């Protein structure tokens, strides 16, 4: 196969080399689940993440765009990602002025978060709590959407997974977030916190100092049916 022999360049000095094969291992990364982990075990992991700390936006713009796919895989290919190094990597990137290599970045970010229990703990631990809370109030909105798959993700499992997310502060986030003329942010949020308040007593509870009662009473009269329906069955588990 020309697995190995197409990242050798990854490594190469020569640009046009590199490039040329910084693209494909992003067509094949998007070549299917167990093709993913191909990927892994070739040697692109490590590679593409050296890509991130480079000047070209051409470069970086590929690198998350293969980084992106292979993030995208298994449970435990994801994991493979997680045990490479570009958890500190990818997350520096979050805090870049280019509005593409953010929006990349981001994306690479949410498709790992969106892992099993192990796997999001792994996150948590990484210290990534609290600097995805911040984006939450970014102007950029483009940001702000991919910062709550991380934060949903990361509340998408046990009760004590979805404590991660109350310790760092997203209670109240969500509550003020909550209050948009966004229709794709006032649904966003709510698939937060009704999340988060889908757990125990414990869990209900640490949801009600948040604020959401009131968001949620409200949206009880809202035109979406959907939105109506989530609403009220989101309310009762509250009561």
């Given at each position: 196969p020309d697995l190995p022999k197409l990242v050798k360049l990854l490594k190469s000095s020569n640009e046009e080399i590199l490039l040329k094969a910084l693209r494909a291992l992003a067509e094949i990364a998007s070549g299917g689940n167990e093709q993913i982990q191909a990927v892994i075990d070739a040697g692109a992991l490590p590679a593409l993440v050296q890509?991130?700390?480079?000047?070209?936006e051409q470069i970086l713009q590929e690198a998350l765009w293969a980084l992106s796919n292979i993030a995208s895989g298994g449970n435990e290919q994801i994991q493979a990602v997680i045990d490479a190094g570009a958890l500190p990597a990818l997350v520096q990137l979050?805090?870049?002025?280019n509005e593409q290599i953010l929006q990349e970045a981001l994306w690479a970010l949410s498709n790992i978060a969106s892992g099993g229990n192990e796997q999001i703990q792994a996150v948590i631990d990484a210290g990534a709590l609290p600097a995805l809370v911040q984006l939450?109030?970014?102007?950029n909105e483009q940001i702000l959407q991919e910062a709550l798959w991380a934060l949903s993700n990361i509340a998408s499992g046990g009760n004590e997974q979805i404590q991660a997310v109350i310790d760092a502060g997203a209670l109240p986030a969500l509550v003020q977030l909550?209050?948009?003329?966004n229709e794709q942010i006032l649904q966003e949020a709510l698939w937060a916190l009704s999340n988060i308040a889908s757990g125990g007593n414990e869990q209900k509870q640490a949801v009600k100092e948040a604020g959401a009662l009131e968001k949620l009473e409200q949206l009880q009269?809202?035109?979406n049916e959907k939105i109506q329906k989530e609403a009220q069955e989101a309310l009762e588990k509250l009561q």
């Open positions: 890509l991130l700390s480079s000047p070209n979050l805090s870049s002025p939450l109030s970014s102007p909550l209050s948009s003329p009269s809202h035109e």
